[PDB]
Amino acid sequence: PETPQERKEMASGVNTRIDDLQMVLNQTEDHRQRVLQAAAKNIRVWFIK
């Protein structure tokens, strides 16, 4: 931002963006795991089908 006391606005804006982005990366990880817990189950059925 090249000016002082605008970097406090920018660093707080990155801080709330990182807090949201780490939540979504946490959320899509347990959503991928909840899918793969259901999807891997009965592939030995599904391959035989």
Partner 1 sequence: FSPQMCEHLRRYNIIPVLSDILQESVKEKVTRIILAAFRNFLEKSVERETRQEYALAMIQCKVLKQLENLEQQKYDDEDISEDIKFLLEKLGESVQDLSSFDEYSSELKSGRLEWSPVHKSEKFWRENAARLNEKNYELLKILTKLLEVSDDPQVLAVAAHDVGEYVRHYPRGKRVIEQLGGKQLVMNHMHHEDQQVRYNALLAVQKLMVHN
Partner 2 sequence: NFEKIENELKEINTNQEALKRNFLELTELKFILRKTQQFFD
Query: What does 27 bind: partner 2, partner 1, none (CB cut-off 5 to 8 Å by kind)?
Result: partner 1
Work out whether 4 is an interface residue with partner 2 (CB under 8 A). Answer: yes
Distance CA 13, CA 21 (A): 12
User: By CB under 8 A, what part of segment 4-33 binds partner 1?
Assistant: 17, 20-21, 23-24, 27-28, 31
Distance CA 37, CA 35 (A): 5
Residue type, 27: Q
Query: What does 15 bind: partner 1, partner 2, none (CB cut-off 5 to 8 Å by kind)?
Result: partner 2
